[PDB]
Amino acid sequence: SVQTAATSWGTVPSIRVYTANNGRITERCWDGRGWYTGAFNEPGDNVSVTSWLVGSAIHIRVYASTGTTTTEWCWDGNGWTRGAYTAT
Amino acid sequence: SVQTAATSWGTVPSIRVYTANNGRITERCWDGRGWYTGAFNEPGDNVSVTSWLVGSAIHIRVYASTGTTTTEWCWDGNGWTRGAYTAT
Amino acid sequence: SVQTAATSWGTVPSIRVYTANNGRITERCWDGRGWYTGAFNEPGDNVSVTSWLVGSAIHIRVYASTGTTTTEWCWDGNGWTRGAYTAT
Ligand SMILES: OC[C@@]1(O)OC[C@@H](O)[C@@H](O)[C@@H]1O
Ligand SMILES: OC[C@@]1(O)OC[C@@H](O)[C@@H](O)[C@@H]1O
Ligand SMILES: OC[C@@]1(O)OC[C@@H](O)[C@@H](O)[C@@H]1O
Ligand SMILES: OC[C@@]1(O)OC[C@@H](O)[C@@H](O)[C@@H]1O
Ligand SMILES: OC[C@@]1(O)OC[C@@H](O)[C@@H](O)[C@@H]1O
Ligand SMILES: OC[C@@]1(O)OC[C@@H](O)[C@@H](O)[C@@H]1O
Q: Supply the DSSP symbol for B44.
A: -
Closest CA to C27 of C14, C15, C16, C35: C16
**What's the gap in Å between the CA of A25 and the closest CA on chain B?**
11
Around Cβ C50, how many Cβ atoms within 10 Å?
A: 22
Q: List residues forming the annotated binding site of C for Zn(2+).
A: 45, 59
The answer as to whether C88 is a domain residue is no
Cα distances (angstroms) measured from residue C36 to each of A82, C27, C30, C33, C76: 18, 8, 7, 9, 20
| Core vs surface per residue A54-85: b (16+ CB within 10 A) or e | eeeebbbbbbbbbeeebbbbebeeeebeebeb
How was this structure determined? It was done by X-ray
Do the domain assignments include residue B88? no
CA distances to A42, B23, B45, C51 from A28, rounded to whole Å, are 13, 24, 20, 24
Q: Cα C26–B20–C88 angle (5° rounding)?
A: 90
Model resolution, angstroms: 1.1
C39 lines ligand 5 (CB under 6 A): yes
Establish if C87 belongs to a structural domain: no
**Total domains in the fold of chain A:** 1
H/E segment holding residue A77: none
In whole angstroms, give the CA distance from residue C72 to residue C47.
Answer: 10
Q: Is residue C49 part of a domain?
A: yes
Report yes or no on A88 lying in a domain: no
> Which amino acid residue places its CA nearest to atom 10 of ligand 1?
A39
Collect all residues of chain A within an 8 Å Cβ-Cβ radius of residue C26: 87
Dist CA C27 CA C64 (whole Å): 12
Answer whether A51's CB lies under 8 Å from A60's CB.
yes
d(CA A75, CA B71): 26
| Contact present, B66 and B73 (Cβ < 8 Å) | no
SS (H, E, C) chain A: CCEEEEEEECCCCEEEEEEEECCEEEEEEECCCCEEEEEEEEECCEEEEEEEEECCEEEEEEEEEECCEEEEEEECCCCEEECCCCCC
Are B66 and B43 in contact, with CB atoms under 8 Å apart? Answer: yes
Does C87 contact B28 at a Cβ distance shorter than 8 Å? yes
B77 falls within a domain: yes
Q: Could you tell me if the CB of B27 is within 6 A of ligand 3?
A: yes
Chain A residues with CB-CB distance to B45 below 8 A: 1
| Distance between CA atoms of residues B59 and A42, nearest Å | 29
B78 is in which domain, residue-wise? Answer: 3-82
CATH number at residue B35: 2.40.128.190
CB distance from C87 to chain B under 8 Å? Answer: yes
Q: Which residues have a Cβ under 8 Å from the Cβ of A55 and sit 6 or more positions away?
A: none
B87 within some domain: no
B61 domain residue, yes or no: yes
Cα–Cα dist A67/A87, whole Å: 12
Which residues of chain A lie closer than 8 angstroms to C17, CB-CB? 48, 63, 70, 85
Residues B40 and A24: their CA atoms lie apart, in Å, by: 29
